[PDB]
Protein backbone atom coordinates (compact mmCIF):
# COMPACT_ATOMS: atom_id res chain seq x y z
CA UNK A 1 0.00 0.00 0.00
CA UNK A 2 0.76 3.71 -0.34
CA UNK A 3 3.45 3.00 -2.91
CA UNK A 4 3.68 6.56 -4.21
CA UNK A 5 3.88 8.18 -0.76
CA UNK A 6 6.43 5.59 0.37
CA UNK A 7 8.63 6.46 -2.60
CA UNK A 8 8.25 10.18 -1.89
CA UNK A 9 9.29 9.45 1.72
CA UNK A 10 12.12 7.01 0.93
CA UNK A 11 14.91 9.18 2.35
CA UNK A 12 12.86 10.13 5.44
CA UNK A 13 12.15 6.42 6.08
CA UNK A 14 15.92 5.96 6.49
CA UNK A 15 15.66 7.76 9.85
CA UNK A 16 12.01 7.41 10.93
CA UNK A 17 9.27 4.84 10.87
CA UNK A 18 10.56 1.72 9.14
CA UNK A 19 14.02 3.19 9.76
CA UNK A 20 13.75 2.33 13.46
CA UNK A 21 13.58 -1.38 12.64
CA UNK A 22 17.35 -1.73 12.31
CA UNK A 23 17.94 0.40 15.42
CA UNK A 24 15.78 -1.86 17.57
CA UNK A 25 16.73 -5.26 16.10
CA UNK A 26 18.00 -7.58 18.80
CA UNK A 27 18.36 -4.88 21.44
CA UNK A 28 17.11 -4.59 25.00
CA UNK A 29 15.07 -1.71 26.39
CA UNK A 30 17.41 0.31 28.60
CA UNK A 31 18.74 3.85 28.93
CA UNK A 32 21.29 3.16 26.20
CA UNK A 33 18.49 2.35 23.75
CA UNK A 34 16.48 5.47 24.55
CA UNK A 35 19.64 7.53 24.12
CA UNK A 36 20.17 6.01 20.65
CA UNK A 37 16.53 6.68 19.76
CA UNK A 38 16.66 10.28 20.98
CA UNK A 39 19.73 10.88 18.82
CA UNK A 40 18.04 9.36 15.77
CA UNK A 41 14.88 11.44 16.26
CA UNK A 42 17.04 14.55 16.50
CA UNK A 43 18.95 13.58 13.36
CA UNK A 44 15.57 13.19 11.63
CA UNK A 45 14.75 16.86 12.45
CA UNK A 46 11.98 16.00 14.88
CA UNK A 47 13.21 18.76 17.16
CA UNK A 48 14.37 19.04 20.76
CA UNK A 49 11.02 19.58 22.51
CA UNK A 50 9.08 17.09 20.40
CA UNK A 51 11.74 14.39 20.83
CA UNK A 52 11.69 14.90 24.62
CA UNK A 53 7.90 14.43 24.64
CA UNK A 54 8.12 11.23 22.57
CA UNK A 55 10.88 9.74 24.74
CA UNK A 56 9.01 10.58 27.96
CA UNK A 57 5.77 8.95 26.82
CA UNK A 58 7.62 5.98 25.31
CA UNK A 59 9.69 5.32 28.43
CA UNK A 60 6.63 5.39 30.70
CA UNK A 61 4.67 3.13 28.38
CA UNK A 62 7.56 0.68 28.22
CA UNK A 63 8.10 0.64 31.99
CA UNK A 64 4.41 0.39 32.88
CA UNK A 65 3.97 -2.59 30.54
CA UNK A 66 7.41 -3.92 31.58
CA UNK A 67 8.54 -4.28 27.98
CA UNK A 68 11.91 -6.00 27.59
CA UNK A 69 12.76 -6.24 23.88
CA UNK A 70 13.33 -3.07 21.87
CA UNK A 71 11.24 -4.41 18.97
CA UNK A 72 8.17 -3.87 21.18
CA UNK A 73 8.76 -0.11 21.14
CA UNK A 74 7.88 0.02 17.43
CA UNK A 75 4.11 -0.09 17.84
CA UNK A 76 4.25 2.37 20.72
CA UNK A 77 6.35 4.81 18.70
CA UNK A 78 3.91 4.50 15.80
CA UNK A 79 1.06 5.43 18.15
CA UNK A 80 2.94 8.34 19.76
CA UNK A 81 4.05 9.85 16.46
CA UNK A 82 0.66 9.21 14.89
CA UNK A 83 -1.07 11.17 17.64
CA UNK A 84 1.23 14.15 16.99
CA UNK A 85 0.13 14.26 13.35
CA UNK A 86 -3.52 13.52 14.13
CA UNK A 87 -3.72 16.84 15.99
CA UNK A 88 -3.12 18.78 12.74
CA UNK A 89 -5.27 16.63 10.42
CA UNK A 90 -7.98 19.03 9.25
CA UNK A 91 -8.50 19.58 5.50
CA UNK A 92 -9.14 23.07 4.19
CA UNK A 93 -12.80 23.81 3.47
CA UNK A 94 -13.28 26.77 1.10
CA UNK A 95 -17.03 26.33 0.56
CA UNK A 96 -19.66 28.98 1.03
CA UNK A 97 -17.82 32.31 0.84
CA UNK A 98 -17.88 35.05 -1.78
CA UNK A 99 -14.98 34.89 -2.22
CA UNK A 100 -13.15 32.65 0.19
CA UNK A 101 -9.87 34.56 0.57
CA UNK A 102 -6.57 32.69 1.05
CA UNK A 103 -3.61 34.86 2.06
CA UNK A 104 -0.46 32.95 1.08
CA UNK A 105 2.53 33.81 3.27
CA UNK A 106 6.09 32.53 3.38
CA UNK A 107 9.60 33.25 2.24
CA UNK A 108 10.76 33.09 -1.35
CA UNK A 109 12.13 29.78 -2.60
CA UNK A 110 9.85 27.44 -0.62
CA UNK A 111 7.16 26.71 -3.23
CA UNK A 112 4.63 29.44 -2.44
CA UNK A 113 3.91 30.38 -6.13
CA UNK A 114 3.84 26.72 -7.28
CA UNK A 115 1.36 25.91 -4.54
CA UNK A 116 -0.89 28.81 -5.58
CA UNK A 117 -1.02 27.44 -9.12
CA UNK A 118 -1.76 23.88 -8.03
CA UNK A 119 -4.48 25.03 -5.63
CA UNK A 120 -6.02 27.25 -8.31
CA UNK A 121 -6.14 24.35 -10.79
CA UNK A 122 -7.64 22.01 -8.17
CA UNK A 123 -10.35 24.46 -7.14
CA UNK A 124 -11.33 25.04 -10.78
CA UNK A 125 -11.57 21.26 -11.30
CA UNK A 126 -13.95 21.24 -8.32
CA UNK A 127 -16.20 23.71 -10.17
CA UNK A 128 -15.04 26.90 -8.49
CA UNK A 129 -14.16 30.19 -10.14
CA UNK A 130 -10.73 31.33 -8.98
CA UNK A 131 -8.93 34.66 -9.05
CA UNK A 132 -5.32 35.43 -8.15
CA UNK A 133 -3.80 38.58 -6.66
CA UNK A 134 -0.19 39.35 -7.60
CA UNK A 135 0.80 40.79 -4.24
CA UNK A 136 4.60 40.20 -4.61
CA UNK A 137 4.64 43.63 -6.16
CA UNK A 138 8.36 44.54 -6.31
CA UNK A 139 9.44 41.36 -8.20
CA UNK A 140 8.58 42.28 -11.78
CA UNK A 141 9.50 38.95 -13.41
CA UNK A 142 7.45 37.04 -10.81
CA UNK A 143 4.37 39.20 -11.40
CA UNK A 144 4.59 38.80 -15.17
CA UNK A 145 5.06 35.03 -14.86
CA UNK A 146 1.91 34.79 -12.74
CA UNK A 147 0.05 36.86 -15.34
CA UNK A 148 1.28 34.62 -18.17
CA UNK A 149 0.20 31.62 -16.08
CA UNK A 150 -3.25 33.09 -15.54
CA UNK A 151 -3.62 33.75 -19.25
CA UNK A 152 -2.59 30.18 -20.11
CA UNK A 153 -5.11 28.74 -17.64
CA UNK A 154 -7.97 31.24 -18.15
CA UNK A 155 -7.79 32.39 -14.53
CA UNK A 156 -7.91 36.17 -13.85
CA UNK A 157 -4.84 37.77 -12.23
CA UNK A 158 -5.04 41.15 -10.53
CA UNK A 159 -1.80 43.10 -10.68
CA UNK A 160 -0.34 46.61 -10.68
CA UNK A 161 2.92 48.26 -11.72
CA UNK A 162 6.25 47.17 -10.29
CA UNK A 163 6.57 48.68 -6.83
CA UNK A 164 2.86 49.07 -6.22
CA UNK A 165 1.47 48.79 -2.72
CA UNK A 166 0.67 45.13 -2.09
CA UNK A 167 -2.28 46.06 0.12
CA UNK A 168 -3.74 48.13 -2.74
CA UNK A 169 -3.38 45.26 -5.23
CA UNK A 170 -5.14 42.91 -2.84
CA UNK A 171 -7.89 45.46 -2.13
CA UNK A 172 -8.54 45.79 -5.86
CA UNK A 173 -8.55 42.00 -6.16
CA UNK A 174 -11.15 41.48 -3.43
CA UNK A 175 -13.30 44.19 -5.04
CA UNK A 176 -13.01 42.49 -8.43
CA UNK A 177 -13.61 39.04 -6.94
CA UNK A 178 -16.85 40.21 -5.35
CA UNK A 179 -18.03 41.90 -8.54
CA UNK A 180 -17.26 38.73 -10.56
CA UNK A 181 -18.85 36.15 -8.22
CA UNK A 182 -15.45 34.54 -7.59
CA UNK A 183 -15.49 31.54 -5.24
CA UNK A 184 -11.82 31.55 -4.18
CA UNK A 185 -9.35 34.44 -4.25
CA UNK A 186 -5.71 33.46 -3.66
CA UNK A 187 -3.42 36.36 -2.76
CA UNK A 188 0.35 36.03 -3.21
CA UNK A 189 2.64 38.10 -0.98
CA UNK A 190 6.27 39.14 -0.85
CA UNK A 191 8.80 36.75 0.62
CA UNK A 192 12.00 38.78 0.57
CA UNK A 193 14.66 38.07 3.17
CA UNK A 194 16.29 41.43 3.92
CA UNK A 195 14.63 43.45 6.73
CA UNK A 196 12.14 40.93 8.13
CA UNK A 197 10.37 43.54 10.28
CA UNK A 198 9.28 45.39 7.12
CA UNK A 199 7.75 42.24 5.66
CA UNK A 200 5.74 41.51 8.81
CA UNK A 201 4.40 45.08 8.92
CA UNK A 202 3.41 44.67 5.27
CA UNK A 203 1.32 41.59 6.07
CA UNK A 204 -0.55 43.32 8.90
CA UNK A 205 -1.32 46.21 6.53
CA UNK A 206 -2.66 43.74 3.96
CA UNK A 207 -5.00 42.17 6.52
CA UNK A 208 -6.32 45.52 7.75
CA UNK A 209 -7.00 46.70 4.19
CA UNK A 210 -8.76 43.43 3.33
CA UNK A 211 -11.16 43.95 6.22
CA UNK A 212 -12.31 47.25 4.73
CA UNK A 213 -14.16 45.07 2.19
CA UNK A 214 -14.89 41.88 4.17
CA UNK A 215 -14.32 41.61 7.91
CA UNK A 216 -13.95 37.81 7.64
CA UNK A 217 -11.10 38.06 5.14
CA UNK A 218 -8.57 36.50 4.99
CA UNK A 219 -10.53 33.31 5.67
CA UNK A 220 -7.29 31.30 5.60
CA UNK A 221 -3.77 32.53 6.30
CA UNK A 222 -1.68 29.76 4.76
CA UNK A 223 2.05 29.40 5.30
CA UNK A 224 4.12 27.49 2.75
CA UNK A 225 7.31 25.91 4.08
CA UNK A 226 9.81 23.54 2.43
CA UNK A 227 10.61 20.30 4.22
CA UNK A 228 14.07 20.18 2.63
CA UNK A 229 15.03 23.25 4.68
CA UNK A 230 14.79 21.29 7.94
CA UNK A 231 14.59 23.42 11.06
CA UNK A 232 14.39 26.59 8.95
CA UNK A 233 10.80 25.53 8.26
CA UNK A 234 10.17 25.66 12.00
CA UNK A 235 11.80 29.07 12.42
CA UNK A 236 9.80 30.40 9.46
CA UNK A 237 6.53 29.08 10.89
CA UNK A 238 7.24 30.76 14.23
CA UNK A 239 8.08 34.06 12.53
CA UNK A 240 4.93 34.17 10.42
CA UNK A 241 2.62 32.80 13.13
CA UNK A 242 3.71 35.43 15.66
CA UNK A 243 3.54 38.17 13.02
CA UNK A 244 0.15 37.56 11.39
CA UNK A 245 -1.54 34.49 12.80
CA UNK A 246 -1.58 31.36 10.67
CA UNK A 247 -4.60 29.16 10.15
CA UNK A 248 -3.11 26.52 7.80
CA UNK A 249 0.22 25.17 6.61
CA UNK A 250 1.37 23.61 3.35
CA UNK A 251 4.60 21.60 3.63
CA UNK A 252 6.31 21.20 0.27
CA UNK A 253 9.19 19.19 -1.18
CA UNK A 254 8.81 16.10 0.99
CA UNK A 255 9.97 14.05 -2.00
CA UNK A 256 13.72 13.49 -2.09
CA UNK A 257 14.66 14.92 1.30
CA UNK A 258 15.78 13.06 4.39
CA UNK A 259 14.42 15.85 6.60
CA UNK A 260 10.72 14.98 6.30
CA UNK A 261 10.62 14.33 10.04
CA UNK A 262 10.43 18.09 10.43
CA UNK A 263 6.66 17.61 9.91
CA UNK A 264 6.48 16.30 13.49
CA UNK A 265 8.24 19.41 14.82
CA UNK A 266 5.88 21.72 12.93
CA UNK A 267 2.81 19.80 14.08
CA UNK A 268 3.81 19.56 17.73
CA UNK A 269 5.23 23.05 18.22
CA UNK A 270 2.34 25.00 16.68
CA UNK A 271 -0.80 22.85 16.46
CA UNK A 272 -1.83 24.60 13.22
CA UNK A 273 -3.58 22.32 10.69
CA UNK A 274 -1.38 21.01 7.91
CA UNK A 275 -3.72 21.41 4.98
CA UNK A 276 -1.57 20.01 2.16
CA UNK A 277 1.75 18.24 1.62
CA UNK A 278 3.72 18.53 -1.60
CA UNK A 279 5.14 15.14 -2.57
CA UNK A 280 5.79 15.47 -6.28
CA UNK A 281 5.49 17.45 -9.46
CA UNK A 282 1.89 16.75 -10.46
CA UNK A 283 -0.99 19.05 -9.65
CA UNK A 284 -2.39 16.07 -7.74
CA UNK A 285 0.86 15.73 -5.79
CA UNK A 286 -0.20 18.73 -3.74
CA UNK A 287 -2.26 16.34 -1.68
CA UNK A 288 -4.59 16.99 1.25
CA UNK A 289 -2.74 16.00 4.42
CA UNK A 290 -4.08 12.78 5.96
CA UNK A 291 -2.21 11.83 9.12
CA UNK A 292 -3.03 8.11 9.11
CA UNK A 293 -1.88 7.69 5.49
CA UNK A 294 1.36 9.51 6.26
CA UNK A 295 2.05 7.36 9.33
CA UNK A 296 1.18 4.13 7.48
CA UNK A 297 3.56 5.00 4.66
CA UNK A 298 6.29 5.96 7.13
CA UNK A 299 6.00 2.93 9.41
CA UNK A 300 5.21 0.27 6.81
CA UNK A 301 7.43 -2.80 7.04
N1 LIG B 1 10.35 18.75 -5.54
C2 LIG B 1 9.38 19.71 -5.27
N3 LIG B 1 9.64 20.95 -5.72
C4 LIG B 1 8.61 21.83 -5.39
C5 LIG B 1 7.43 21.53 -4.69
N6 LIG B 1 6.62 22.65 -4.55
C7 LIG B 1 7.30 23.63 -5.15
N8 LIG B 1 8.53 23.17 -5.68
C9 LIG B 1 9.55 23.91 -6.43
O10 LIG B 1 10.08 24.90 -5.60
C11 LIG B 1 10.64 25.91 -6.42
C12 LIG B 1 10.23 27.28 -5.82
O13 LIG B 1 8.95 27.40 -6.12
P14 LIG B 1 8.18 29.02 -5.99
O15 LIG B 1 6.80 28.48 -5.97
O16 LIG B 1 8.74 29.55 -7.28
O17 LIG B 1 8.83 29.49 -4.71
P18 LIG B 1 8.47 30.92 -3.82
O19 LIG B 1 9.73 31.75 -3.91
O20 LIG B 1 8.09 30.45 -2.43
O21 LIG B 1 7.32 31.36 -4.70
C22 LIG B 1 10.02 25.72 -7.84
O23 LIG B 1 10.99 25.14 -8.65
C24 LIG B 1 8.88 24.72 -7.58
O25 LIG B 1 8.61 23.85 -8.64
C26 LIG B 1 7.17 20.20 -4.22
O27 LIG B 1 6.24 19.73 -3.61
N28 LIG B 1 8.25 19.30 -4.56
K1 LIG C 1 -6.46 51.06 -0.30
MG1 LIG D 1 6.70 33.38 -5.43
Q: Are residues 151 and 254 in the same domain?
A: yes
Number of domains in the chain: 2
Residue 265 lies in a domain: yes
Residue 93 lies in a domain: no
Is 113 assigned to a binding site? yes
Main-chain phi, psi angles of 164, to 5 degrees: -65, 160
Say yes or no: CB of residue 108 within 6 Å of ligand 1.
yes
Do 81 and 115 fall within a single domain? no
Whether residue 107 is annotated as binding a ligand: the answer is yes
Pocket test for ligand 1, best of 108, 111, 251 (most atoms within 8 A of CB): 111
Q: Whose CA is nearest to atom 25 of ligand 1?
A: 114
CA–centroid distance, residue 113 to ligand 3 (Å):
4
Q: Ligand 1 pocket, 112 CB below 6 A?
A: yes
Q: Is 293 annotated as a binding residue?
A: no
User: 24 and 168 share a domain?
Assistant: no
What is the extent of the structural domain holding 15? 3-87
Which of 11, 105, 114 to mutate for ligand 1's pocket (most ligand atoms within 8 Å of CB)? 114
Considering the domain boundaries, does residue 152 fall inside one? Answer: yes
**231 and 199 in a common domain:** yes
Picking from 57, 87, 117, the residue at the C-terminal end of a domain is: 87
Residues in Cβ contact with 141 at an 8 Å cutoff, skipping those fewer than 6 apart: none
Contact 119, 102 (CB under 8 A): yes
Give distance in angstroms: CA of 158 to centre of ligand 2: 14
- 235 CA distance to ligand 3 middle (Å): 19
Residue 92 lies inside a defined structural domain of this protein: no
Query: CA torsion angle for 158, 162, 164, 170 (degrees, to 10)?
Result: 20
Cis peptide bond prior to 108, omega within 30° of 0: no
252 known member of a binding site: yes
Q: Is 183 annotated as a binding residue?
A: no
Are both 64 and 143 inside the same structural domain? no
Specify the ligand 1 atom closest to the Cα of 224: 20
The verdict on the CB of residue 135 being under 6 Å from ligand 1 is no
Q: What is the CATH number of the domain that holds 15?
A: 1.20.120.140
CB 206 within 8 A of CB 170: yes
Q: Residue by residue, what is the 3-state secondary structure of the chain?
A: CCHHHHHHCCCHHHCCHHHHHHHHCCCECCHHHHHHHHHHHHHCCCCHHHHHHHHHHHHHHHHHCCCCEHHHHHHHHHHHHHHHHHCCECCCCCCCCCCEEEEEECCCCCCHHHHHHHHHHHHHHCCCCEEEECCCCCCHHHHHHHHHHHHHHCCCEECCCCCCCHHHHHHHHHHHHHHCCCCEEEECCCCCCCCHHHHHHHHHHHHHHHCCCCCCCCCEEEEEEEHHHCHHHHHHHHHHHHHCCCCEEEEECCCCCCCCCHHHHHHHHHCCCEEEEECCCCHHHEEECCHHHHHHHHHCC
Cα gap 49→55, rounded to integer Å: 10
Solved by what technique? Answer: X-ray
CATH number (domain holding residue 247) = 3.40.50.300
Amino acid sequence: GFARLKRSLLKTKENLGSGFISLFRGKKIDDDLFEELEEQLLIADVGVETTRKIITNLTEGASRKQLRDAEALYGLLKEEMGEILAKVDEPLNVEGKAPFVILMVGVNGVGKTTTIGKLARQFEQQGKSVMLAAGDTFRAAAVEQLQVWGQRNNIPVIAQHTGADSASVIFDAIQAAKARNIDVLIADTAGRLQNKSHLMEELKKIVRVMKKLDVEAPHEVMLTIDASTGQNAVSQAKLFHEAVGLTGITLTKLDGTAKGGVIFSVADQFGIPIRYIGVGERIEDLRPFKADDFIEALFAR
